[PDB]
Symmetry: D2
Subunit: 309 residues, 4 copies
């Protein structure tokens, strides 16, 4: 029981929005209908993604994120985004059921300008923090480019991560100390040989490269990085101490952001592949989080947890 | 033209009205509910569009030009593909907590389009629905086409005759093979298998039984259609039957997908609101597949 | 690479009975590989499962630092089960008629799958195999291990939050307020319908507090968790936003997913058998708990 | 029977976590073993299906045309298996890079079977012997090329499809010339490039294309006249080969992506994709003589 299905879902608009340009020009093509529905579906789902995303963005801005009671809702909604993105990557299968030769039979009645022109997808990219002729649309796109990105909102939250406090756990200090010492112990172990020595020097460069705030700041300006040095510390804190209750769900959030990044990538790849199939990365907003995962500090070196709290 | 205008996004993306918000207390998860079901409908529309197109290719009689069989299989396959995506789409709503659902259940369901689909395929069973119940179902249109299958001609290949002959003879040969099992333990077990198999195998030739079961609802194709089907199944390697076989396989897939969709839709209702069925339009085709005639018994084509 | 993965065994495990008997199904190979794959994945599921079971038995579960590992590994099980449900697609690429062409060389069953069912807590083979199956029937099921953990859920303490007391109080009061709302507008068709819903809901809502009913149904098999466990669950369900309950909630959701996937797997496995040869949730309580539709306003406040 | 039939005695006793063997048993390694053990099982099936199609070409049975259904069926099956494999990446995405590092100590890893597959399809000691056979024996691309060259209607003394095509395209372009101006000249260049055997031969040598000029004609014949019974299933075969190409690509992409995730565009059937791109208007497609097949 409920209000009339069609009326509630406003199917009067949804199911009366299908206008085959083939039919309008006289020469009706069967496969065009699929093209309309497919892209109409993508948009419906984009709308939901933006809806979920914008909601999490507020939970950061409105500062509710500070109440760690809200972290479950955050992870849930972000996860949902990845799930939707997966379905969208699968949905490419539907259009793969259309022959290039059949496509050409209606390509003639398609404008080249808006070949992408998914305002919603641009909005999504902007909103997440990735890297057009419109009016009121261009106004919305403006809001997108102007307002605070998820990357931005998460950066702040990451910077406020507990344990970074120097007069507290001094995590970064302890890390720099223990890594420097352990490398030295390795150097003493070294003192095949030439190959081993190379590994050491290479590892050393990488391992010590964090703690070169200057390098980070440069690369941040150069675009190679996007998070603050402090944020990087927040992240690693969460990564290393994820088993710690107050970090368990936060870790999940980070993992989810990385999934969303890769799915987004996959979607673009499939979208490109399809365009070449029909008519013959700097996009990783959370690059830093992937990189943080790569940093191969041995377990023995990870600063041990005091009675803490 | 231009993306939004071409896709008429002005309607599709302005169709989301959370009854929660309208009544004052907006809930976040309702939006998902609207979009999810709005998506199902979009896809139903495409399925009906593809289906109706195949139905015509039968009615208009173009199906007689076997040049059209590729288009038919292609479009029918597409239906199954779309149905698969729909069965996967259930994952999206599984991302909604029953407890969150209850928070909007108080505010705010059968898809006319889905009923139309069921009718159009031939599920036993403003009023567009009427046209659906009245017009020729795919089952009906396929039945006719199956009845006109080549080789069924009695004064020709007399496939059915040859089959009844070869099966009867082979069973007898098996009976002789069994008869000298020296009253063993295995023998009695073997004899049971034989009798069971015999009953099933020879059941196929009891037009009366079929006609009864047809009336009872247990079967849905004509006796002649059953013969058309088996002809295609046994001789599918034969060029003129290769694609036709694909069509039959596809109809069976669509049946099972349709079933899966209903199962998930029921499962979800019990999951949210907290408390094969004669729904296999192509039952006969599944059954035909089961018939375990040895290959050497299948009437030879020469 | 081959040595590390011991492919020397994994490959050279494929013997088409058709070929051995002199014929050749040329599709039997798929049958072997498909089922060989299912088994590989079952092994991993049992491996992950047994690991979670220990984290309960060894009592490490008490350290809520370990809850992440638990949810992670349990989630992984569901992911693997999904892949297994998708893997049915591979065998759907085999014609019944082609199957029959090698079914002749086959006999009428995964120990591993039985082991899984037992281990999770679902209600013949060689000796040593039967020994493993014995361990399965004997050892403590995940359902059992989670029951205990659920019973120790915080807030159930009567001298503490007295959650159940507060709940019975608040539900009784709210229903009464609804009863007062009833006869608020002149007895109508809509009113009569609403009044029915109320009576129905009341019966259900108040049934929750009938320990006797539970105990009976527990004996009858209709339920599987302890009354106390049911309380632990609801505590977690209602107060899942609460930090110490966030991940625990996830664990419960995961157990329910695993149940439904397991169901789906059996359905597809049955469907396939009928397709080829012709012609109950361990965590029922958790699903049921989800159904109980208490309004938010009624949930005992956490202050 | 059961375990014995599936020889699970080998399959389920092939699990040695190097971590455990060296003393430091790591839980996630088991998944690594099973995951890759599964990939290999499926590769074996893909090779099995592939080799089978390859023979049906070599043994010349493909000529019968009754065998085309089996061919498409088995090739389709390959794509299905490849899809499952692309989905299987999800399982390993359930492993944290941080957990991986905790057993990366036991690292050395490329699948002989996958290389064998690539060779067999036609990607440009005793193990090395098998790999040799792979590089030596006739690739599917090769076997399909031959079959494509024998496509009906390419016969110049027959339908002279290519001739008719060149004629009809040239005429229609002229009509357009009599009738954006840049677009025309550009399109013309591309459209007429198809008839430059020299260009093809060069690009074939350069590697940019892989099918024979004649094969290209066979393909287009099938593409344009796919509605024709006797081309219907052949068209399916071509579509399937293209799918297999893209799936293979996807698998490599995910495999690379995973390696970068954990440790920190040339298709065998390029020609077939390209053929699809060449967008001849319907009105131009040479009409089928009363001698249709
Ligand atoms: C009170 C707090 N939620 C603390 C906080 C910030 N970032 C975190 C990351 C992981 C764990 C905790 C935090 C806040 O400052 O918002
Ligand atoms: C000319 C025809 N299409 C012949 C026909 C009918 N049913 C078939 C099944 C399989 C193969 C061919 C047929 C017709 O009579 O429609
Ligand atoms: C310390 C504890 N892990 C407490 C506990 C038990 N069940 C729970 C459910 C949700 C949250 C916490 C618990 C234990 O008693 O083992
Ligand atoms: C008899 C044949 N199968 C002819 C042939 C070759 N390629 C084709 C493509 C489509 C249709 C037919 C063909 C043969 O040469 O084996």
């Amino acid at each position: 029981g409920g209000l009339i299905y069609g009326n509630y879902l406003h199917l009067e608009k949804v199911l009366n929005a299908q206008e085959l340009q083939s039919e309008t020009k006289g020469n009706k093509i069967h496969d065009e209908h699929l093209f309309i529905i497919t892209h109409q579906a993508y948009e419906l789902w984009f709308k939901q993604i933006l809806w979920e995303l914008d909601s999490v963005r507020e939970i950061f801005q409105n500062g509710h994120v500070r109440d760690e009671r809200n972290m479950l809702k955050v992870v849930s909604r972000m996860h949902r985004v990845s799930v939707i993105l997966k379905l969208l990557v699968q949905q490419f299968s539907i259009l793969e059921t259309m022959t290039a030769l059949d496509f050409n039979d209606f390509r003639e009645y398609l404008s080249p300008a808006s070949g992408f022109q998914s305002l919603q997808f641009r909005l999504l990219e902007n909103k997440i923090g990735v890297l057009n002729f419109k009016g009121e649309e261009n106004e919305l796109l403006l809001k997108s480019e102007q307002e605070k990105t998820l990357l931005e909102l998460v950066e702040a939250w990451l910077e406020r991560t507990p344990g970074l406090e120097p007069h507290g756990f001094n995590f970064w200090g302890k890390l720099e100390k223990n890594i420097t010492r352990g490398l030295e112990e390795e150097f003493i172990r070294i003192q095949e040989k030439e190959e081993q020595v190379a590994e050491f020097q290479k590892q050393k460069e990488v391992l010590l490269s964090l703690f070169d705030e200057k390098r980070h700041e440069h690369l941040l300006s150069k675009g190679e990085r996007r998070l603050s040095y402090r944020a990087l510390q927040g992240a690693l804190m969460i990564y290393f101490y994820r088993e710690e209750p107050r970090f368990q769900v936060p870790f999940q959030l980070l993992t989810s952001l990385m999934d969303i990044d890769s799915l987004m990538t996959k979607w673009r790849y499939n979208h490109v592949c399809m365009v070449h199939r029909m008519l013959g990365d700097r996009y990783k907003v959370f690059v830093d989080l992937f990189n943080l995962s790569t940093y191969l500090i041995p377990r023995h070196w990870i600063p041990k947890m005091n009675p803490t709290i």
